[PDB]
Design a protein around this ligand. Structure first.
Ligand SMILES: *[C@@H]1O[C@](F)(CO)[C@@H](O)[C@H](O)[C@H]1O
Ligand SMILES: *[C@@H]1O[C@](F)(CO)[C@@H](O)[C@H](O)[C@H]1O
Ligand SMILES: NC(=[NH2+])NCCC[C@H](N)C(=O)O
Ligand SMILES: NC(=[NH2+])NCCC[C@H](N)C(=O)O
Lengths: 781, 781
């Protein structure tokens, strides 16, 4: 039995006393509130909040039976007897405590509304709506998973509801979530220890909800543009010669390549026994500085793997112990335990000593030429209960280990190279880890169609809760004895339309596309080149993700927020604003039914126009593509393919506009900067191109403009080819800034025409110079 | 009747007095002699000699009836009565005067040996052996020529004999050559005026003959590497917008492009009336500095056309007259005459005033950003007899006008940009013009199969007499009403294997490959890319041409100097040392008979091995290639394709070696420098890679090395893939500098293998790092 006794309102937090203790409420924004139970006691700090100490001014009002603590849009309604808090946006109930907080173990119980659908929990393969499921909150490997998992590498103690709120359990400890499984109408959060707090974030739409969520948990800094390029990876290159041979293979096979990734053989010849060496195995990598410099000359970055563990057999054991860098046992000695790789300890990233020691090693390797970092096994993969960290035992801090590891490395990289954007790829984190630039991948997926078929669900679940660059080991990682060629092709095709292009797998079967047969390469080469040609599209989506948290992959349900049934879809998704992608995830599929939203759509590959009032579209499949539809009104921007983003230029732009009278107004943008300055957005050192189309019965008008302060090397004038798909055959003239130009009606492909209409393709091509001043192009019948 | 009277031997020239006057003999080298009749009188200087005043020490010996003036290898035997000079190499008679020199008009008569075959005269379409022909020495347009011409743009007063000598008529005047036509056994040279001299050069082989010839007439300076890239050209881009649209089309169609060429519309909107303006038509080219700068940003050079003529209607007429820059009439007034383009005069490049005036204009335009120069109509196309130049009348200097024009422009460009290599493309020159960097093309060829079929004969005739970069308007230039697609494709395929890749034609039919249909582009795109991938092969041949005069295209007859019948062949030729090319020059050809020299040959496209003891090889044709055979023992070097040579890198090399036991020793080289320094060779600022193969019964050994001082940006270590074609399946191991490496026998395409044998292709691939130290690779059975 819990009831209200008293409250204090200073400041600007609400402190409530019940018969059971203190509760602190603080608005972290107009749309987000942090609720801390046991506010009286000492406990772990928030990990989820980007600014834990902030508290914006709210209004408090009191009545006989209730308190009301209200921010801009979000209101907390506090019922005095029995004590229960409920949350409202406008006058709409979002979420209500049932029993709410209960003590010893930590326990939060909320009511769920009938029909309420619940996404969340991070990586699970359970269905998009996780209501009716119970699962642990304990980051844990799931080697070789395929089509089901209740527990994987990167769980999140957070949910997103069809009521358009996000609830975060701001707790790092071994726990569990019960989403109306045990009791149909109860959401239960549990933890063995740790912080007893939750955060509720509201929004008026899913995009606004995600914007509000990332406002308080952190926005991802724009990654280096090279993160969007082609990665060479396997587990693992065995030598410098093999690594050099692989870079060379990309050159001789004419596949783009930005980055090569070195797995654990860079520090030892065996899988076991060397982890912790954190230094080059000179028997097999004899000249690593020259190797990295030679790669940089070819525009290729080098990324190295690192892990939390230092083995007793490794060259750094004695030094780590001496430095007090490792987690301890209750006795105060370094804790050693049996990992797959051997007996070893874990670097205590929560301590000053561990952080300084580990950071110094990253600094040294980075000075040698390492461009980015891969942090594997950060669950931590093995984490005995009696392990003691500076701020708590293993079970208490477990789900924040990887998160703090990312923070440490992010801070380190920014201190060493304040003019570069850190690249940090990790397997396990916490709510908010995106603010440290964490780029997660979905772990050791099996080489099965089931493994591929689960990737959209996983990506969308992580994308919705803050992680825009979630991606998979393309082609599959685990086991297998011979390449499943059709599966591999489908996986690398899908790869083009998801955040990071990194084929990776155990090296008994090649993961890199350059080591495939002629048919496979003939299919994938123009697709990897397409990835590069589409960099302006992808990099602009990245820009929007940094600005607003908008994920690069968006679920189908964004298309109609009043149709909750769409939430179940995990087979079609949006890549940026304009492309509806439906990966092929079974062998031999001859056609697909695409649940395209009501409107006009074009076949990305064939230009075919489809119109639908709601009924799904049936498209035939082929081996060389996967089904992709373009939304009418889309501006799709391209640059010429380059081999590496170091050579990226937009002196030449080609933009495809998908015209249809059903879209009388359309807008596009292209974000351009130097691809590397971490401060480009803050300082406005960018070139933001905007395009607006106005489509009426007798005219199609485009207004082009540029804003921003520009940047070093920005082209003053871009040669631009605008291709208008589904263009009327009735346009008689073009005005460019008032100057009339005839539209040629033949030989469009065979003359340097400035305006020409191709009657067979229904395409109207305009070629012009896009300089710094506004440009108006008007087509008139 | 002529007879010897007296001689003086100082110094070191021989001066002979006959009853008719003085004759001066001077060795210009051990292998070349200049013979000047009327040595007593004042006459035009030599144009053919690079060092006219030189005279090396020779030996003179006298007998009752003869004088002997002897250099290293060449000896002049002077018969006293009747007077006649004959020339010997060793004790072999090369050439004997008949009546020799006869006066008023200039006339030289020599005996021809029975069976002696005679190439020469420069551009004619008459058959490789011109014996039995008579033709004028008067540079003259032959618009729309096809399969026959006795008189074209670029005649040369020179012949090459199967006796392995070259005879030059060192005379610039309107004349004629009668090669045993009128009198079966007489070679007659005639001129209306000008210098009465000839030069005889001997050699012990055709390569040595050409080396000796270019030693005394001039060696071509290495062109900028960009000269070997893709040119966009037509007659003509009508505006800046059209020019920008064409550069953009190369970008959007993914064809390489180094240079765009602007025809006469850059200075006026009409073909007639504007010539002489030598300045931008701002109505149609409003921002030419920005245009050229924008192209440079994309790695694209701009070349402008210029002509010798200044029209009275042009903006520069009054100024040219004021400056005394134009040729005059006998009265002393500027000479004006009716050209196709209108009434106008000719710039007197032979005068100080004309040279200074014209040079100042090139300087100004070059400062604005023009990268190279196209000089059209230098015959001069129209040249009235009464026209007076500073050094003689039109008929006297005619065939040296273009030559002096090139010298003027070359000197100008070197003075303005001493750190760049001039690019000078012209239609008409003289013996020796190559020393001013002249790059000639074969004029206004018709768009017919006949026009294409004549190009090998023309190229070989010019190549043998000093002009390595002779080439054609690819696809054809003149007339036509609709594209002959098959002809166009064949012409641009041949284009890949001849010196300069410049499609060009009258613009009612597109000349650029980017304006062609999908099938045409699908065929040509990978071929234009091949051109770029083969830059190390082509640029190395260019290097050899600068060193020794060795032409890039070599005739079949080089393959067997004891088989004079080969001289007639004008259908197959060598592109560099290793490729035997047979262009397809008729429609619908289904197969070809290739007269491959005795030995082992491989199909360049299919890898098929052929062996022949002399009988021709029959190969089937296809539309996507033309027949090319690779000589056994060839090292064919490639780099990855780039869009422009400004991006050229050899960090990655791929080298194909064509192994056969019939070739126990083979050598290759790759010349690398910065692609732009005119002094790179002289100063040894280059990286010369050498490869040697030793092929025995049980071993194949490669020795790799580098010499030269290197250059700025040179890669220290190149990733190298060596592909050995027709490799034995019996090699069991590889030693690289003594370190043994196993040869994998499977999965060569699908692993980062360092050594692997592909049993299905009979190819053995080695991948390694080629650094600055010598490298030995040994394969052993
Ligand atoms: C962690 O472990 C590895 F298997 C070996 O380092 C990686 O290759 C794998 O991608 C990652 O999950
Ligand atoms: C000279 O005249 C032109 F026809 C016009 O300038 C050129 O296009 C042609 O290539 C050249 O022979
Ligand atoms: N994280 C997981 N859900 N792991 C499931 C592992 C199941 C497997 N049979 C094992 O015990 O090893
Ligand atoms: N240089 C030449 N061979 N020209 C031949 C031109 C022939 C042509 N019938 C004419 O008189 O115009």
């Amino acid at each position: 039995a819990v009831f209200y006794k008293e409250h204090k309102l200073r400041n600007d937090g609400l402190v409530i006393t019940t018969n059971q203790g203190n509760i602190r409420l603080q608005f972290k924004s107009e749309a987000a509130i942090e609720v801390l139970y046991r506010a009286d006691s000492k406990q772990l700090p928030s990990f989820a909040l980007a600014q834990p100490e902030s508290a914006i001014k709210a209004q408090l009002t009191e009545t006989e039976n209730h308190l009301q603590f209200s921010g801009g849009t979000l209101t907390a309604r506090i019922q005095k007897r029995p004590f229960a808090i409920s949350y409202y946006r406008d006058s709409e109930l979002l979420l209500a405590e049932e029993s709410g907080f209960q003590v010893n173990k930590i326990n939060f119980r909320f009511y769920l509304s009938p029909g309420e659908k619940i996404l969340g929990g991070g990586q699970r393969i359970l269905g998009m709506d996780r209501r009716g499921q119970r699962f642990p909150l304990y980051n844990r490997a799931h080697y070789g998973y395929s089509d089901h998992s209740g527990q994987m590498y990167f769980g999140l103690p957070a949910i997103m509801s069809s009521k358009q709120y996000i609830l975060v359990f701001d707790n790092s400890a071994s726990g569990a979530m019960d989403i109306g499984k045990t009791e149909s109408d109860i959401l239960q959060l549990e933890a063995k220890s740790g912080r007893s707090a939750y955060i509720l974030v509201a929004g008026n739409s899913y995009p606004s909800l995600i914007e509000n969520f990332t406002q308080v948990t952190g926005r991802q800094p724009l990654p280096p543009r090279w993160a969007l390029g082609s990665f060479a990876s396997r587990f693992g290159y065995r030598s410098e010669a093999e690594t050099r041979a692989t870079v060379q293979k990309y050159k001789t096979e004419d596949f783009p390549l930005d980055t090569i990734v070195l797995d654990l053989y860079w520090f030892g010849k065996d899988i076991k026994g060397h982890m912790g060496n954190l230094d080059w195995d000179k028997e097999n990598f004899p000249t690593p500085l020259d190797m990295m410099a030679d790669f940089k000359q070819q525009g290729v970055k080098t990324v190295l793997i690192t892990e939390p563990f230092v083995l007793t057999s490794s060259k750094r054991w004695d030094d780590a112990v001496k430095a007090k860098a490792l987690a301890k046992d209750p006795q105060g000695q370094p804790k050693a335990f049996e990992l797959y790789f051997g007996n070893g300890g874990i670097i205590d990233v929560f301590s000053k000593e561990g952080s300084r020691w580990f950071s110094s090693i990253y600094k040294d390797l980075s000075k040698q030429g390492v461009a980015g970092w891969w942090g594997d096994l950060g669950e931590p993969e093995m984490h005995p209960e009696d392990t003691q960290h500076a701020i708590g035992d293993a079970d208490t801090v477990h789900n924040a280990y990887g998160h703090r590891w990312a923070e440490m490395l992010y801070q380190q990289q920014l201190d060493q190279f304040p003019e570069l954007r850190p690249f940090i790829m990790m397997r396990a984190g916490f709510v908010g880890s995106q603010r440290y630039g964490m780029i997660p991948w979905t772990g050791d997926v099996s080489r099965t169609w089931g493994g591929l078929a689960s990737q959209v669900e996983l990506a969308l679940q992580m994308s919705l809760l803050g992680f825009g660059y979630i991606h998979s080991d393309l082609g599959g990682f685990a086991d297998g004895e011979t390449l499943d060629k059709e599966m591999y092709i489908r996986w690398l095709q899908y790869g083009v339309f998801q955040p990071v292009y990194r084929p990776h797998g155990q090296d008994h079967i090649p993961s890199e596309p350059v080591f495939q047969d002629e048919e496979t390469k003939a299919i994938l080469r123009p697709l990897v080149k397409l990835r590069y040609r589409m960099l302006p599209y992808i990099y602009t989506a990245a820009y929007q993700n940094t600005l607003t948290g908008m994920p690069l992959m968006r679920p189908l349900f964004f298309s109609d927020e009043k149709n909750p049934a769409l939430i179940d879809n995990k087979t079609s998704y949006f890549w940026g604003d304009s492309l509806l992608v439906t990966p092929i995830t079974q062998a031999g599929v001859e056609s697909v039914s695409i649940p395209a939203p009501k409107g006009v759509w074009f076949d990305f590959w064939k230009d075919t126009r489809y119109q639908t009032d709601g009924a799904p579209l049936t498209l035939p499949t082929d081996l060389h593509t996967i089904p992709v539809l373009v939304k009418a009104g889309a501006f799709m921007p391209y640059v010429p393919a380059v081999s590496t983003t170091e050579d990226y230029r937009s002196d030449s732009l080609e933009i495809h506009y998908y015209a249809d009278a059903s879209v009388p107004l359309a807008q596009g943008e292209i974000f351009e900067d130097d691809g590397k300055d971490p401060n480009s957005i803050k300082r406005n050192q960018f070139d933001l191109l905007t395009l607006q189309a106005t489509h009426t019965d007798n005219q199609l008008h485009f207004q082009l403009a540029r804003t921003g302060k520009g940047y070093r090397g920005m082209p003053e004038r871009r040669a631009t080819t605008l291709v208008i798909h589904n263009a009327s055959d009735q346009y008689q003239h073009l005005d460019i800034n008032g100057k009339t130009i005839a539209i040629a009606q033949a030989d469009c492909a065979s003359t340097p025409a400035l305006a020409c209409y191709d009657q067979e393709r229904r395409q109207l091509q305009l070629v012009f110079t896009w300089g710094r001043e506004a440009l108006n192009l008007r087509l008139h019948k």
